[PDB]
Each structure stands twice: as structure tokens, then as C-alpha cells.
Amino acid sequence: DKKWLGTPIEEMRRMPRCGIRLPLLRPSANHTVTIRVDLLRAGEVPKPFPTHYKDLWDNKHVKMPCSEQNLYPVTAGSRWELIQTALLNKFTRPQNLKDAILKYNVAYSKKWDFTALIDFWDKVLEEAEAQHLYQSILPDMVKIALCLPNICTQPIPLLAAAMNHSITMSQEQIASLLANAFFCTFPRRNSSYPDINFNRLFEGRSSRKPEKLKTLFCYFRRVTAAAPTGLVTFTRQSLEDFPEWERCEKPLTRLHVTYEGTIEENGQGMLQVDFANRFVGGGVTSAGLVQEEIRFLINPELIISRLFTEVLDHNECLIITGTEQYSEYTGYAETYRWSRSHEDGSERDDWQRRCTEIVAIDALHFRRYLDQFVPEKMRRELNKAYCGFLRPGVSSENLSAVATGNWGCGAFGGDARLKALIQILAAAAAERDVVYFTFGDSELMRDIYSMHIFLTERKLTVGDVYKLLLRYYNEECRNCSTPGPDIKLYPFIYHAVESC
Ligand SMILES: Cn1c(=O)c2[nH]c(SCCN3CCOCC3)nc2n(C)c1=O
């Protein structure tokens, strides 16, 4: 019967109700703001700041395709002029789009296959859909792409490793950048940054990529029919000092656990976990189509983090506030399908950001299952999750619940019961409640609930629980000679505590 256990999801903190009154939006040394704050108003397209395009071409900023320093061999010609000449042509067949994109990517004319784009256009779309694509949608995408210098007038700093820095930009500015990415215009991007140009979406024989392209075109149709009016903030967070887990005397926090529902639909206004790759967005611009890549497709503004976010080190995360949902879907991986357009009904905060906060935290990939019970590996996951959850200088009553699930399970080989306890401990340390979605696994729901209430009723601290994890390693894992231990973790914990 029972679809959820624990604290009712209704009793969990959410944005905007729980939120602090935001300080005045303004640029600072650690906050790049690319719009006119004095003109930011509800329901109005933000005005770029500055008024005129300013260029930086260096190792600390995005290399813009419209830079006068973006050159091609002829003597040197302007590659931005070449990109205009190429893209300002009628498309009537997918070959025409391939040929356009290759005019300014000539070194890749042999290497970039467009099979998936061709299949999408010719073999997946209805003839009327394809018509609307080349008559309306692609020309509008070209125009927003070519408007980049008037839209993205302010250099965009890279969120490099170890930087604690935020970029607040307009949804409109993202749209212009993403249209550039579609047309593969970002220079020098073809090794510690994710791919941004969309060339791999077009290549190879694929059933996933046509569905990816349906999802992205749904977005591009929307933001070219009418400019979106809000802002999005991208924050890299890198922590210097981590808890002494074994000494942590904080209590556990509340838990809601359910096998029905999704982070994105049922965790509205909560801190939504992206089960991330350390290259944020994972295989979104290529073949990947599981939880991170789906989120990045239905909220495509997340993709632009790939333009400027260096690969995450162990102590870092990326926090994205304000992305809008444009699509709905069913399935995942081989069964993923674009369903329909989604009208996002989220309220906006006082910076006109959708009240949607997503954190990219990358779990480790465990080729050997027992490796993840090694203390250094448990601490690594605790500290990553803690970095993703913690908000320095916010009171606990202003913190939404964490909406998450089986982080690093699936391809990464994580143990769901261990990872649930790790996230429960990290959340407790960050003074946040947990909303946990087991994604149809009703046994796992009961198991996590049963363990959580056992530890709470016995008033064990974060430290008490961590020590029991160390016991489990030392007694059942360390000198274990088979692929799996003799005794499972939760049974071990119950016996260890009930024995006291
Ligand atoms: C809680 N949760 C998920 O676990 C999830 N997984 C997927 S894709 C398939 C892979 N997963 C299967 C469950 O283990 C995580 C790996 N999409 C998801 N969404 C939207 C979600 O809300």
C-alpha cells in the first residue's frame, strides 16, 4: 500500500517559503553579473551590462566565437565573419546544415559525422515537423546565435578549479550561447573542461540522439519564439576544511523516503541532486542519457555550465539556481523519449531566478564493489555530499530539504544502502532534512526508513554512525577475500547497536 515512509514531504522546507531575503544583486570580485541590476524587473527581458561588447581572449575567460581574436587561415580572416556567411543560408535539407557548420570547422570535415542529425531530420521527424525546423526554428536559432555580441557583452570568467565564484546571467544570454553551441561555433573547444559544442549529438548511428534533439529543439523553439525573462546563477563551491566525521556530535535530521516520484517533479523548491560526472553534464552533448543527462536536457540552461566549469576536484561542487524546465519525458537510456513541452510554474526569487536549485556532485566510480567501504572512500563521498549541501552563513531554518536518491549507483557501482546513509550523514552535518526517491525500489524504501528511524530513536550522532561504518569496514570488508562481505551493512549495524 504505503508509497512513502517517515516525515511527510509536506513538513519539509522548500523555496521560496523557507528562503532568506536575498541581498541586493551586485557584481563583486567573486560575483560576475552580466545584466543591468538597476533595470531588473519582473516579467521584463534583462538588459545586458555593459552596453557594448567587451572581449577577453585568455586562459581565465570563455573564448567567445565573436572575438576579433577568433581567426581562420585564408593571412588571417575573421572566423566570426565566416560563421555569419555560413549560417546565413537557407536550409532545406540536413546536408545544408552539415555543410554550413563545417565551413568554419574545416579541420573536422572528415571527422564529424552527422548521421544522427540526418536521421533525426529525415527519418524521425514528420515532413511537416522537418519543414517547420528549416523554415522557422533553425533560422531563429541562427539569429539568436549571431546576436551574441549584443547579448553577451561582458566576458564570462571560467569557474576554474579551487575558485569560489558565481556567475549570474540572463536566461536570454544562455539561449544565445547554447545556439552557438548547437552550431559548434565555440573556438578552441574541439582537456580539463567538458565538451560544449554539440557536434557529438549529430554523429553516429543512434536512437537516443534523435530524442535528445527533440528535447533540445523544444527548448530552442520556446526561447526563440519569445525571450525568457529570468536569471540563472552558477556557483562553484570549493571547501578547504571538512568535518572530523568520527567526532561529529550532531544528530541526524528528518527523512522522507518514497519509491514513487522524481527529484525534479516531487522535490520542487528543494536542493535537487544531480548525480553528476566530474565533467559536469556527463555525456549530455554525446551518448549519455541517465539522470544527469536527462536533467541537463529538460533544463537545457544547465548545459551552458560546460562552457565555463572546470572538472570538479574531490572538494568541489557546482550549484545552479534558476534553471527552467522546458520539456517532459518518459523512460531513460534506451527507453528515453521526449514527451511534450513543459510550462514551468515555479515562482521566481527576488533576483528573478526560478526557485529551482540543483547541485552537481559527482560520486566515485567503483569497479570493485568492496572498494567503497574503504574509510578514505567513505570519507571522500561524505565530504563531496557535504560540500554539495553546505551553505556557509545560512541558518538551518532557511535551508530546503535535500531531494536525492541512489547517487552513484547504476554505472558507478555504488551500494544504495551505503550511499543513502552517507547522504543522510552529510545532510545531518549540513543541517538539512532528506527527501529520498528510491526510483521504484519499494524494499530499499523500507530498508532506508527502518535504519533511519532505528538510529534516530537511539539518538546516535553522525559520529556514532560513522564509527559503525568504520567497524563494518574493519570487521567485514578489510580482510574479506570474496567480492562481497559475509554480512550486509544494515544487518551489521543493527546487530552492533542492539549488542550494546
Ligand atoms: C531519484 N531519481 C533517480 O534515482 C533517477 N535515475 C534516473 S535514470 C536511471 C538510473 N538510476 C536508477 C536508480 O539509481 C540511480 C540511477 N533518473 C532518475 N530520476 C529522475 C530520479 O528522480
Q: Is 277 annotated as a binding residue?
A: yes
Which residues does the annotation mark as catalytic?
A: 274, 292-293
Report whether 298 belongs to an annotated binding site: no
CA 410 to centroid of ligand 1, rounded, Å:
9
From 293, 439, 442, the mutation candidate for ligand 1 (largest count of ligand atoms within 8 A of CB) is 439
The response to whether residue 439 sits with its C-beta less than 6 Å from ligand 1 reads yes
Q: Which three cell numbers stand for residue 264?
A: 525534479
CB contact set of 100 (below 8 Å; sequence gap of 6+): 86, 87, 89, 91, 183
Ligand 1 pocket check for 282: Cβ under 6 Å = no
How far does residue 448's CA lie from ligand 1's centre (Å)? 16
Atom of ligand 1 nearest to the CA of 262: 22
User: Does the C-beta of 299 come closer than 6 Å to ligand 1?
Assistant: no
| Centre of ligand 1 from the C-alpha of residue 368, in Å | 22
Method: X-ray
Specify the resolution in Å: 1.8
Reduce the secondary structure of the chain to three states and give it as a string.
Answer: CCCEEECCHHHCCCCCCCCCCCCCCCCECCEEECECHHHCCCCCCCCECCCCCCCCCCCCECCCCCCCCCEEECCEEEHHHHHHHHHCCCCCCHHHHHHHHHHCCHHHCCCCCCHHHHHHHHHHCCHHHHHHHHHHHHHHHHHHHHCHHHHCCCCCECECCCCCEEEEEEHHHHHHHHHHHHCCCCCCCCCCCCCCCCHHHHCCCCCHHHHHHHHHHHHHHHHHHCCCCCEEEEEEEECCCCCCHHHCCCECCCEEEECCCCHHHHCCCCEEEEEECCCCCCCCCCCCCCHHHHHHHHCHHHHHHHHHECCCCCCEEEEEECCCCCEEEECCHHHCEEEEECCCCCCECCCCCECCEEEEEECCCCCCHHHHHCHHHHHHHHHHHHHHHCCCCCCHHHCCCEEEECCCCHHHCCCHHHHHHHHHHHHHHCCCCEEEECCCCHHHHHHHHHHHHHHHHCCCEHHHHHHHHHHHHHHHHCCCCCCCCCCCHHHHHHHHHHCC
Separation CA 439–CA 411 (nearest Å): 15
Q: Is the peptide bond before 50 cis (omega within 30 degrees of 0)?
A: yes
Going by C-alpha positions, the residue among 457, 429, 406, 423 that lies closest to residue 258 is 406
| Distances from the Cα of 19 to the Cα of 142, 164, 170, angstroms | 39, 22, 21
Among 495, 454, 439, residue whose Cα is nearest residue 471: 495
Residue 423 assigned ligand-binding role? no
Tell me whether residue 406 is annotated as binding. Answer: yes
Between the CA of 257 and the centroid of ligand 1 the distance, in Å, is 14
Q: Which residue type sits at 438?
A: T
